[PDB]
Design a protein around this ligand. Structure first.
Ligand code: HEM
Length: 182
């Protein structure tokens, strides 16, 4: 995954738990020979998994919980790190932003060539609900989507409820989320 993801995890932990805790995690992740993450450079996915795994152990929180927090953090973090305009061009409401999600990831995809973005499809079921279909080349990142959706809720002063209804882990084709919103 691109450096920006690892920078954000790093930033999230440093800001909440301090520089020492970050170093402890860094060490345990097996990444002490890396002084900084380069935001526009592609890293092996392993870097991210090892980071999250290491932080799970050092912080005493399950990985899935950290992925949720990371998901929430990302919406705010990107607006401050080069993507404020891009975010604003994706919409004025949550359902609109969700429709534009592939588009948004493609507009990053011009900048970042070796991107492997997820694919999202919205089936609207009412003016206050939708089904969100999530397909990915990667495993175990559905909890991250849950945090992203709450981030977006916060962004749009919109109350939101997200419940996963289908899991790859039980053998379903792809993850599906039921979403209700203000
Ligand atoms: C400007 C805002 C956003 C930017 C700049 C952005 C950019 C990125 C980038 C660079 C990656 C890594 C892809 C790779 O390295 O292959 C990624 C991954 C991902 N994105 Fe976003 N993204 C944004 C918003 C969102 C939102 C709102 C969602 C809501 C569901 C989302 C869902 C995901 C998921 C689930 C992944 C994990 C990769 C995977 O599933 O394969 N992104 N994003």
């Amino acid at each position: 995954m691109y450096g920006l993801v690892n920078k954000a995890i790093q930033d999230m932990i440093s800001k909440h738990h301090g520089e020492d805790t970050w170093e402890a995690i860094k060490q345990k992740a097996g990444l002490e020979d890396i002084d900084f993450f380069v935001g526009m450079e592609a890293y092996s996915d392993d870097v991210t998994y090892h980071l999250v795994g290491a932080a799970s152990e050092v912080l005493g929180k399950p990985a899935e919980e950290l992925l949720i927090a990371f998901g929430e953090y990302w919406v705010t973090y990107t607006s401050e790190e080069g993507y404020g305009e891009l975010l604003a061009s994706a919409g004025d409401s949550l359902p609109e932003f969700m429709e534009n999600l592939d588009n948004l990831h493609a507009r990053v995809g011009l900048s970042f060539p070796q991107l492997r973005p997820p694919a999202f499809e919205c089936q609207h079921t009412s003016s206050k609900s939708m089904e969100l279909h999530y397909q990915s080349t990667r495993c175990g990142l559905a909890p991250m989507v849950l945090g992203l959706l709450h981030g977006l809720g916060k962004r749009f002063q919109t109350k939101v409820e997200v419940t996963q209804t289908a899991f790859r882990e039980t053998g379903e084709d792809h993850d599906i989320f039921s979403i209700k919103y203000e």
